[PDB]
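RETRY 2/3 - previous attempt timed out on the joint model. Re-submitting the same 321-residue input unchanged.
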Amino acid sequence: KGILKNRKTVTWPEEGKLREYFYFEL
Amino acid sequence: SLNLDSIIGRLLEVQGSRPGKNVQLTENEIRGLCLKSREIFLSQPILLELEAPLKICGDIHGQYYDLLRLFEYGGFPPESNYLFLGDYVDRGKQSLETICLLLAYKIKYPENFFLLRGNHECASINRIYGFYDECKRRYNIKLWKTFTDCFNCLPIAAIVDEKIFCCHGGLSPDLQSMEQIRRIMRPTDVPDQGLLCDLLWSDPDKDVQGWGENDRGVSFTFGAEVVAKFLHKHDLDLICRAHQVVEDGYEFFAKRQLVTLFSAPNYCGEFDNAGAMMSVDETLMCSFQILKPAD
Ligand SMILES: [Mn+2]
Ligand SMILES: [Mn+2]
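RETRY 2/3 succeeded.
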């Protein structure tokens, strides 16, 4: 199932779905 | 003769343990991690050609429990694919646990886990900024030199689906063809100047036109126009790099043509920055997962 090689375009989502936050106790 | 699953299990067992317990592997287990991962680095290209989907991470700097949080939230291997952009050791308190887990995952999942070289994966740097002192305190000088020989074989850059160019530092004024990267022979040290140095040291600067002198005293800075001409000449869409701390964990440059990733939150207790991790799906749609302490 590897991803190492031996036509796509970069895209970004709607600005609401750009960041996903994870908060933790320090 | 490497019990990789036992190493990984002991590395992962300290999850959720307050305070920051160490994971003290044996000297021979760490030497096996170095030598086996070293073979895999040399058998794979120095310029990695990868395929989406994967998650890309910035500097860790021995913040081991922040590395565990990156895997917990992004998916422990092999639930997700990973490409790291270097600077695994120095400054932090647990460089050994950090690099050992990364090398272990590299051996366990050699075509779904990838590690690039940062400017701190270099003996003349990490002798000073912490890693050597950690190796001397918890093991011995011989093991530090074993790490150096391993680090000297790390790949230098990666290209994801022929559109996202990845390295630790940034562009080089001496980079005209990707073949110049593929021609670098391993093992090698990081020179004080040139293409290999620039790939691990240079930075983008919003205030420079073309190439400028870097405040670090090494390599150069480049401006928004250098990024655009580089992307156009090589039919690329984005440059993904690390090497600089950014408050939100990620930071765009030159109208989203370059992004800086930094994955160590609250950088060695000196900043109140977040840590980010860029997820790219199979269609090359890129989003950010941000790690931040609750306030
Ligand atoms: Mn760094
Ligand atoms: Mn760096």
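Chain B has one domain: 2-295. Closing ticket.
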